[PDB]
Structure formats: C-alpha cells, structure tokens
C-alpha cells in the first residue's frame, strides 16, 4: 500500500498534496519556458493486486523562439541553434553603418510559443 517514489521531471515539478501511499494523487507541471506533454496527474492505485502509479511522468519540452531575423549591413554576433526563454541575440552593423535601434533582443514566451521582445535593429550608413 505504498507507491514508488514519484521521480524527477526534467524541467518540471511534481507536487504531492499529501503523501504517495494508496490513494494519493501527485500533479505534474513544467518550469517556465517549457510546456508539458503527457499526464498532468497520476494516482496511486492498486492495479490487479499491486500498488503503483496510474500515469507515467510527463516530459517538458523547451519552448523555442523562431530563428532570429537577419539585418542587412549587419550580423548576429554568434547566432544559436535554438533560442530559449531568457536567451538573447546581439546584433552588429558593418564598418560604415551606424546602428538605428535595438542592439540586442531576447527570447520571451507567449502562450507556449517563443517570440522575440522587439524588432531587430536596422543598420544605416
């Protein structure tokens, strides 16, 4: 009448409103910048004639912004493969072009989807 220790959800949290013995229900969630895919909850049942969880732990996938735009007469100081929450991008102009705007922008989330905070800067010579 006692379930297996819940376990860890990478980039997630398991909340146990009251123990894990027969009858308990633990909840699943994902840290900011991650959406859940799988069970949102699990119950300690007595399947057959044994005590175990009802649902498997879920996964939390990284919410990524789309690929950052490119600016004419300027470049991305080391662009990345994937961009996640909090992670930014920094732009630069070419050697005769004066920057007009936003030096660096950064990846924010918005309804489980990664969007950039602002527009990329422009580069005027």
Q: ∠ CA 20-22-23 to the nearest 5 degrees?
A: 85
Q: Provide the CATH number for the domain formed by 63-123 in this structure.
A: 2.10.70.10
Residue range(s) of every CATH 2.10.70.10 domain in the chain: 1-62, 63-123
Half-sphere exposure of 40 (CA within 13 A, CB side): 1
CA–CA separation, 64 vs 112, rounded Å? 9
Check the CA dihedral 114-117-118-121 and report its sign: negative
CA–CA separation, 99 vs 101, rounded Å? 6
Question: What b-and-e string marks burial along 17-30, b requiring 16 or more CB atoms within 10 Å of the CB?
Answer: eeebeeebbbebeb
CA–CA separation, 122 vs 64, rounded Å? 24
Contact criterion met (CB below 8 Å) for 107 and 83: yes
The structure was resolved experimentally with X-ray
Q: Which residues lie below 8 Å from residue 6, measured CB to CB, with a gap of 6+?
A: 14, 16, 20, 26, 42, 53, 57
Contact criterion met (CB below 8 Å) for 17 and 30: no
CA–CA separation, 125 vs 117, rounded Å? 25
The third-level CATH classification (topology) of the domain covering 1-62 is Complement Module; domain 1 (2.10.70)
């Amino acid at each position: 009448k006692s379930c297996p220790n819940p376990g860890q959800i990478r980039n997630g949290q398991i909340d146990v409103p009251g123990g894990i013995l027969f009858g308990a229900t633990i909840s699943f969630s994902c840290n900011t910048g991650y959406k859940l895919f799988g069970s949102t909850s699990s119950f300690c049942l007595i399947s057959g004639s044994s005590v175990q969880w009802s649902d498997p732990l879920p996964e939390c996938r990284e919410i990524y912004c789309p690929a950052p735009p490119q600016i004419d007469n300027g470049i991305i100081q080391g662009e990345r493969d994937h961009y996640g929450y909090r992670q930014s991008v920094t732009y630069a102009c070419n050697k005769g072009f004066t920057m007009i705007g936003e030096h660096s922008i950064y990846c924010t989330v918005n309804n489980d989807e990664g969007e950039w905070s602002g527009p990329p800067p422009e580069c005027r010579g």
